[PDB]
């Protein structure tokens with residue numbers, strides 16, 4: 001067998017033009033091929049523009065329409081995503097002009113607000129600046145936009161999310177005030193332009209939770225924070241996205257989500273979202289890759 005790696009690692013230098021150009025050309029072909037018989041002359045013109053931009057600047061910028069197409073095709077190309085059947089239902093937020101961590105935080109607040117929609121969940125992706133030389137990466141160090149902290153007990157058992165024990169310690173190490181509950185929402189840890197990450201508490205009013213029906217509960221919004229979007233040889237190492245829950249196992253239910261009017265992929269929702277998708281009809285690439293946990297690769301500039 002010849003599987004590919006599902007992981008795309010860091011770089012220390014810009015992608016070589018000899019490697020970048022063929023990938024860009026192939027993506028430009030995929031995009032204009034989505035029109036099939038139209039736009040031959042526009043296709044060729046974009047090819048020339050992209051090629052001269054790469055030759056002059058070492059890289060290129062996607063148009064907004066190309067970016068939107070890319071995020072949706074990468075979604076379509078996600079092997080295990082059940083949601084991908086309605087891939088046209090995706091809202092894109094273009095944050096490619098973002099420069100600071102504070103600005104990242106505001107983009108993410110907007111994303112969480114839009115996607116949560118008081119429970120009527122909408123799928124969205126926010127795209128931060130593409131990798132340049134690999135020394136100025138944007139990254140969310142979180143695995144999810146919303147997730148509970150995990151604390152190790154003296155007996156070896158975990159309080160909270162057992163899967164986040166390491167990340168939770170990192171937050172504490174970064175100065176995050178360690179509460180000790182079973183449902184403490186982790187802070188956003190945000191890296192801008194390759195700098196050391198900064199810690200931002202998520203405004204509590206932005207976190208919608210479903211109370212189970214006892215003591216249990218969970219967050220309504222499943223958002224993956226840590227993957228990298230690849231398209232036309234370009235890499236976007238910060239591109240958080242969300243859908244809604246499957247419900248078959250959230251980790252804490254099907255009644256409680258439905259009761260509090262929080263979207264899950266039940267039969268009604270499956271049918272309606274596919275219906276909405278269908279109405280929009282009026283090496284895989286692009287692709288979402290996993291990355292190496294950034295605290296394992298980051299070179300600390302301040303380390304205080």
Ligand code: HEM
Nearest residue numbers: 075078079080081082083123241242243244245246265288
């Ligand atoms: C609208 C609701 C959505 C639902 C119900 C949904 C559901 C799922 C489920 C059940 C998984 C599989 C987990 C596993 O078995 O490993 C998954 C994986 C994934 N989803 Fe979604 N998803 C949705 C939206 C999205 C969106 C909006 C994107 C991105 C634009 C997306 C990208 C992915 C990716 C990249 C994976 C991992 C794929 C892999 O590793 O094979 N999903 N999703």
Ligand SMILES: COc1ccc(CCNC(=O)C[C@@H]2CN(c3cc(C)nc(-n4ccnc4)n3)CCN2C(=O)C(C)C)cc1
Nearest residue numbers: 081083144221222223224241242243244245246247249250
């Ligand atoms: C909303 O869809 C679901 C996502 C996660 C779950 C729980 C199962 N958990 C996982 O699969 C763990 C992670 C996180 N994971 C998540 C987690 C969250 C909160 N959300 C998503 N997701 C949202 C939209 N698409 C995917 N995906 C992706 C799959 N994961 C992997 O480790 C694969 C590499 C095997 C149920 C439904």
